[PDB]
Each structure stands twice: as structure tokens, then as C-alpha cells.
């Protein structure tokens, strides 16, 4: 089947809307909760991916838009 574009875009649009909304907080919208670092000046930091938590819950839709080829 050479129609791997229209159906992929429709299922993507469904998955894009179902991917750009990771509950906005989900009580844990990141890799994990706050934890302890190893050896640096960030013992009471937010997380190792606080700015990337946005990239994670946002990246779901980005991963769908990029891998929505076929």
C-alpha cells in the first residue's frame, strides 16, 4: 500500500492532540520526582531535567510529528 501519507497524517493528528497534553502536571510530568544529585552544586535543585520536563511532555507530540512518516 502506497497510501502511507493520508492515514499516517490522520492518525498523527489524533496522536498529536493526544500527545501535546501530558495532563500539564500529572503530579509527575517529568522523568521522575525530585531526587539527590551525585557531586555538584545542585543538591537542592529542581531536577536534572526541569527545563527538559517541558521538552519531555512537549516532545511527545514532536516525536509523533517526526516519526509520523508512514
Amino acid at each position: 500500500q502506497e497510501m502511507f501519507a493520508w492515514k499516517m497524517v490522520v492518525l498523527s493528528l489524533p496522536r498529536i492532540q493526544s500527545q501535546r497534553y501530558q495532563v500539564g502536571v500529572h503530579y509527575e510530568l517529568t522523568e521522575e520526582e525530585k531526587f539527590y544529585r551525585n557531586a555538584l552544586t545542585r543538591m537542592p535543585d529542581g531536577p536534572v531535567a526541569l527545563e527538559e520536563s517541558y521538552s519531555a511532555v512537549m516532545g511527545i507530540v514532536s516525536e509523533v510529528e517526526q516519526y509520523v512518516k508512514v
Partner: protein, 268 residues
């Protein structure tokens, strides 16, 4: 051909580097992306996009997980999800979570249809009929048939988890028993993989869609099992390694105003 589907589930990602490299995102924690895979016909690929979406997390993404396991996989839907063989609780939890994730992606999306189980009775009867015996049958499986390949990975940490709480291979034998109990309770491939051992996760999925795959537990590192390896008699009798016979409890039991006022009162 067109694009098929498989919904591999990984709880919030949590290091899918080795497990994903052994089989095939926006970040390390994106959430229900659309990954893929493909099958063959002895020479090359024939547009058979038998996608295996390794959804590393599903934060409020039930629709994305359902879109991943599309309805186009009626002829072949074998979800091969990653797991953690460090303990028996994680192995049994990941296998039951794989079957429940396939059922969740189906039932959370197929609420309108109902004759699917009716057609699945005859189709899966003709399919699993020639795949039930030769476990190296009659196993108490679920209400219907959802092929969920429980790929038990991370058995390199099984030794650390087995020595930190048992100082021997007791937790390893417990993980083997967890895979065997979930297999007899579901009827699938409890293929486990350790450090450089039994790299056959999609092998059972390919042999039971419409390469090699071993099955042994004597090495006490990776209790591999094929799609049909399901029994509860000899494995249940030998399940007494640091536990009882036919146990499942291991999974559940293992998963300056006041200052000025004070100065004034002190001066009195």
C-alpha cells in the same frame, strides 16, 4: 502492504537505551510516541510496516497509545515491550502490564465494537491451536487472546538485586518463577535476556505473527521461554526456591517586631 501495529509499553521510559538497541523520541521521557518495525518474506520488505511502537511512557496519552496499536493489526498484533528482570515483582508486573496494556489500548478504543471477540474466537482458535503445545496444551489464560511478548530485559542487575536481599540466586529463581507463573496464566513467550544471553525478543513475535529463540533457566541468569511455554506443575513444584510452591505473592510483597517586643519586655 500497509502498516500493521504493536503497542510495546515502557513505564515512563526509564532508560530504554539498551532495551531499545536490542530491538530497534522527543526526549528521554516524551510519552507514547509512534515507533516501528517490519516483517519479511524471505527476500526483503514488501511495504509490510509491522510497526512496534515502543511507547516510553504514556502521560495522559491513551489516545496516542491507541493510535499506535491501530486496528490494522488484526492479522498480526504482537506487542514486544521491555522489562526489568532485576526482581520477580518487576518481571511479573511488566508481563501482566504488557497484557493489560494491550487490553487497555484495545478496550479503551474499541468501546463501539463488540463482535471482535466473536471473530477472534475462530481466528485465534485456528492460530493458537497449532501453537499451544510443544512447550520445550491447557494453560489458564485470560478471557481473550492478545499477543503480548514479555521481553524480560535488565537481568544484568538481577545479580545485584539477588545478592542485596538474598546473597545468592534466590531472586533470580524467583524472577524465573514469576515469568513461568505469568506464562501459565497468560500463554505466551517468557523469553528473558541477561548479559550477552538470549537476544530473541521479536523472534516469538515473528514465529507467531499471522532468527532464532532459545529457552533455558539452568544458567540462573535468563529464563527464556517460547510462545507456548506455559505450564504450572513442574515449575510450580520447583518454585520453592526461597519461597513456597506456585507463589505470586513475591510480586505483591516485592513491588524584628517580636524581637523588639521581647527587648521591651526584657527591659521592663
Amino acid at each position: 502492504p500497509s502498516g500493521k501495529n504493536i503497542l510495546v509499553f515502557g513505564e515512563d521510559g526509564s532508560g530504554k537505551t539498551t532495551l531499545m538497541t536490542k530491538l530497534q523520541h522527543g526526549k528521554k521521557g516524551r510519552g507514547l510516541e509512534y515507533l516501528y518495525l517490519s516483517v519479511h518474506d524471505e527476500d526483503r520488505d514488501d511495504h509490510t510496516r509491522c510497526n512496534v511502537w515502543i511507547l516510553d511512557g504514556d502521560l495522559y496519552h491513551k489516545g496516542l497509545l491507541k493510535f499506535a496499536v491501530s486496528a490494522e493489526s488484526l492479522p498480526e498484533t504482537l506487542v514486544i515491550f521491555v522489562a526489568d528482570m532485576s526482581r520477580p515483582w518487576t518481571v511479573m508486573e511488566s508481563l501482566q502490564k504488557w497484557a493489560s496494556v494491550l487490553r487497555e489500548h484495545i478496550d479503551k478504543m474499541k468501546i463501539p465494537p463488540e463482535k471482535m471477540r466473536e471473530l477472534e474466537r475462530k481466528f485465534v482458535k485456528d492460530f493458537q491451536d497449532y501453537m499451544e503445545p510443544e512447550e520445550g496444551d491447557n494453560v489458564l489464560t485470560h478471557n481473550l487472546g492478545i499477543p503480548v511478548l514479555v521481553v524480560c530485559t535488565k537481568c544484568d542487575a538481577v545479580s545485584v538485586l539477588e545478592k542485596e536481599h538474598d546473597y545468592r540466586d534466590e531472586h533470580l529463581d524467583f524472577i524465573q518463577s514469576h515469568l513461568r507463573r505469568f506464562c501459565l496464566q497468560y500463554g505466551a513467550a517468557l523469553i528473558y535476556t541477561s548479559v550477552k544471553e538470549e537476544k530473541n525478543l521479536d523472534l516469538l513475535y515473528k514465529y507467531i505473527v499471522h532468527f532464532t529463540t532459545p529457552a533455558l533457566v539452568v544458567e540462573k541468569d535468563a529464563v527464556f521461554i517460547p510462545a507456548g511455554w506455559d505450564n504450572e506443575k513442574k515449575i510450580a513444584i520447583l518454585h520453592e526456591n526461597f519461597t513456597t510452591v506456585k507463589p505470586e505473592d513475591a510480586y505483591e510483597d516485592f513491588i524584628v517586631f517580636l524581637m523588639k517586643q521581647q527587648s521591651l519586655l526584657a527591659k521592663q
